[PDB]
Design a protein around this ligand. Structure first.
Ligand SMILES: Nc1ncnc2c1ncn2[C@H]1C[C@H](O)[C@@H](COP(=O)(O)O)O1
Lengths: 520, 104, 104
């Protein structure tokens, strides 16, 4: 920060720049930060509300807030998102630049119902980014409080709190307490501003393409293989009795399923099938009971969304996996809603390489046949990785999360966030912010005790974030036209992705990245 | 190092997710009869288990549970018979110690 | 322009102005919803604009006097193009540009 009170500390930048193979998206918002917990750290636990053995937790809640811009629609307008997914086979972030400026602090007083708000010029806020990843990382959990979709909106900064190890509702001795005033933090008055730059580590391009071939069909339809398979264990029946024979054919156009193949579909961890038409579902509650969930340290944790898998089969639109999809709300929807209010995403583009989430991986033989014994087989509901598997990660959506932090561990297998996006070992740091305490008048004779009495105040201002995205051009030689993302065209009562008569911005549908096709 | 957090609890306890999950396949029973409905909530502080998560626990290859207090164990020999072992070239080879997994 | 003046393919740009929102005190526990609650305020100040106009001189050889635009001359209750007793500025008549003549 340089100049004084009457000089703005930074300009509004919200813009998109499409140049060559890069796209530089800048977005600026206006934020407001309350005073959390009356400047106190409080240990929160599930002991207060009984809950259940699976939902128990122990942790801390802090006065600090934090900035979240982990969703795409923060950085992209629906138009810009349309250019991205129509013209390109992939994109990944490169650089990041972050600014706070035009900081204002207000003090508020309450007298007999009157609420008076006045500028407090000399009070400060505290901002620090954690570069060393020393704090618990609560980003990537898909919480709210991210910058709004719509530039003209104003948002409130969420509170920062974290969870640690526990036994029941108590605290095991490995539990950690992190005091956030124990880090260096820059203090900013109304003239000061805050800025830093960041550079993403190298990650694979996201795949914005949907394959035009399937694993089983990669063959050549016109030509007949030179590899035999075992066609029949009996002689061709003449209508009398089956007679033992071994007969081998060649894989060919007639029979593709029997034909030899180099590759296997991706792994699957299966989940229940739910239909959108109510009368086709069973009458019972199978939501939690018939759920697909993993058992960790005595806790049954629902598997959501789970391993990336095709949501439904070919001809079945209405079915969806119980836990296997990302689900979004329509504008103005509460936290408890019915089916019509949610926006449900499906992955139909991974059908070629991936199993259907609601169905088996395959079938495998469970016993040794003999003359007297008959061949038996069992179904494979779950399958780990086998040599020769290929798969496709879950798509990212305009509302979906951009990145998540790969935990620090001895090992991991093909880390990518199951919700979607870019797994990062060193993600964009957490930016934390707090209103510095201002004490109310002290008693005039010394007492050691904690104040607990402060001037109520809040601070507002603008925040801007600029990410440099890298692109991968579409090389395809396909003759016929691609699928594209297309606006409505026919007349309707109001425009999609635009404010209504009341000024409420609304997103009508989710938008995935996979339209353009390429060979498998 | 021993982690101070768990995979399921990596979330933020104070804030409520923007992703819905499928909460119930019936209407909230009024004590009469279950009625088909689909209802979605938000993952939040109340219900952490239903909440969406980016990561999965490590692989496991399971093994039998033995208690150090004798009277709690079954009376039989399950050591080799009820053992967890892999079958290689007609040989049954005990899996020891096995994939790294929390003991208790 | 059928109304008049200079048709421009790149006219003087539109200058837009807005008062940046100032939020009223937030609730102190996090809610996702839109604020809708702000401090009522307005802003005032000065604006100046300077245009450089180019002229074309009158070359005419006409012998007799031109028509001109002439003020009233005879006494009247108040001056034209000037404030009245109440301070209200007033324009009595429109004034076109075409007086001087030239050959067709
Ligand atoms: N999402 C994500 N983040 C980080 N690392 C990943 C991810 N998905 C896969 N991988 C790893 C696993 C592959 O062997 C390799 C491909 O990197 P390539 O660059 O394509 O050669 O990268």
């Amino acid at each position: 920060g340089a100049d004084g009170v009457g000089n703005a500390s930074g300009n509004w930048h919200c813009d998109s720049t499409w140049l060559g193979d890069r796209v530089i998206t800048t977005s600026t918002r206006t934020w407001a930060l309350p005073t959390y917990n009356n400047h106190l750290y409080k240990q929160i636990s599930s002991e207060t509300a009984g809950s259940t053995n699976d939902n128990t937790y122990f942790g801390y809640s802090t006065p600090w807030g934090y900035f979240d811009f982990n969703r795409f629609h923060c950085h992209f307008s629906p138009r810009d998102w349309q250019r991205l997914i129509n013209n390109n086979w992939g994109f990944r972030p490169k650089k990041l630049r972050f600014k706070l400026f035009n900081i204002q602090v207000k003090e508020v007083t309450t007298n007999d119902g009157v609420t008076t708000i006045a500028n407090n010029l000399t009070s400060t806020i505290q901002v620090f980014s954690d570069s060393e990843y020393q704090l618990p990382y609560v980003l990537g959990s898909a919480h709210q409080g991210c910058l709004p979709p719509f530039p003209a909106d104003v948002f409130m900064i969420p509170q920062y709190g974290y969870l640690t190890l526990n036994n029941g509702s108590q605290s095991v001795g490995r539990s950690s307490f992190y005091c956030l005033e124990y880090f260096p933090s820059q203090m900013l008055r109304t003239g000061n501003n805050f800025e830093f730059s960041y550079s993403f580590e190298d990650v694979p391009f996201h795949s914005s393409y949907a394959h035009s071939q399937s694993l089983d069909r990669l063959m050549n339809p016109l030509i007949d293989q030179y590899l035999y398979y075992l066609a029949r264990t009996q002689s061709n029946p003449g209508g009398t009795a089956g007679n033992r024979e071994l007969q081998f054919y060649q894989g060919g156009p007639s029979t593709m399923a029997e034909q030899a193949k180099n590759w296997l579909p991706g792994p699957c961890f299966r989940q229940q099938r739910v239909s959108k038409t109510l009368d086709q579902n069973n009458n019972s509650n199978f939501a939690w009971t018939g759920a697909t969930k993993y058992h960790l340290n005595g806790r049954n944790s629902l598997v959501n969304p789970g391993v990336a898998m095709a949501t439904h089969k070919d001809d079945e639109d209405r079915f969806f996996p119980s836990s296997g999809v990302l689900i979004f709300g329509k504008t103005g929807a509460t936290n408890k809603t019915t089916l019509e209010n949610v926006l449900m995403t499906n992955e139909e583009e991974i059908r070629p390489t991936n199993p259907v989430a609601t169905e088996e991986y395959g079938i495998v033989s469970s016993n040794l046949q003999a003359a007297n014994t008959a061949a038996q087989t069992q179904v494979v509901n779950n399958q780990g990785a086998l040599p020769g598997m290929v798969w496709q990660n879950r798509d990212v959506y305009l509302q979906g999360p951009i990145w998540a932090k790969i935990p620090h561990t001895d090992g991991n297998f093909h880390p990518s966030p199951l919700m979607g996006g870019f797994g990062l070992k060193h993600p964009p740091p957490q930016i934390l912010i707090k209103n510095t305490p201002v004490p109310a008048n002290p008693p005039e004779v010394f007492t050691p005790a904690k104040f607990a009495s402060f001037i109520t105040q809040y601070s507002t201002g603008q925040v801007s974030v600029e990410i440099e995205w890298e692109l991968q051009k579409e090389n395809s030689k396909r003759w016929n036209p691609e699928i594209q993302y297309t606006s409505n065209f026919e007349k309707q009562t109001g425009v999609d992705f635009a404010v209504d008569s009341q000024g409420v911005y609304s997103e009508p549908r989710p938008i995935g990245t996979r339209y353009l096709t390429r060979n498998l």
